[PDB]
């Protein structure tokens, strides 16, 4: 029963924790990040920051 | 292509020194830096003019404007 109850759970998307960006909704700096080379290589990398305290999302490029 | 007469940057004249510069390289067996400084080339722009010159005039000269093939 315990093993089944553990196996009925979904994938937990735990994101990298950092304390530099400031959220615009709750202003709690516990905002996760993800950065990649997605925009055209004529321009630098693109970062996307998501607040894990309220659900805010934004982009910096 | 024959050596530029003047320096593109400081206005100096380097055209006449090419013949004497070539002499020091094999008759005196000197290095390139000391040979370049032996002729009063002190700014590195004049050294740039003389040092990096591709003398293409000795290849066209073995040739005629008439009948090149492909």
């Amino acid at each position: 029963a315990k093993q089944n109850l553990y196996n009925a759970q979904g994938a937990t998307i735990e994101r990298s924790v950092t304390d530099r960006f400031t959220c615009g909704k709750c202003k709690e700096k516990k905002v996760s990040y993800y950065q990649l080379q997605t925009r055209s290589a004529d321009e630098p990398l693109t970062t996307f920051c998501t607040c894990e305290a309220c659900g805010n999302r934004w982009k910096f490029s | 292509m024959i050596v530029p007469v003047r320096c593109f940057s400081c206005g100096k004249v380097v055209g006449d020194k090419w013949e004497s510069y070539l002499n020091l390289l094999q008759e005196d067996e000197l290095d390139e830096g000391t040979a370049l400084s032996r002729l009063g080339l002190k700014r590195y722009c004049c050294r740039r003019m003389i040092l990096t010159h591709v003398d293409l005039i000795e290849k066209f000269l073995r040739y005629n404007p008439l009948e090149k093939r492909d």
């Binding site: 321009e43 630098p44 | 593109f8 940057s9 400081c10 206005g11 700014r43 722009c45």
Partner: protein
Amino acid sequence: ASRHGQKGTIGITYRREDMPFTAEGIVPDLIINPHAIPSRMTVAHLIEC
């Protein structure tokens, strides 16, 4: 264009009097902007220079 993907166009030409000079009387044959270095990360341009 340079050998590191940095190309541009001539926007104006100046005569040797309006060119900034060093204490030794040397003058730049051309002048480029430094706002082109960071986002392109062409450190090889600087090292080649």
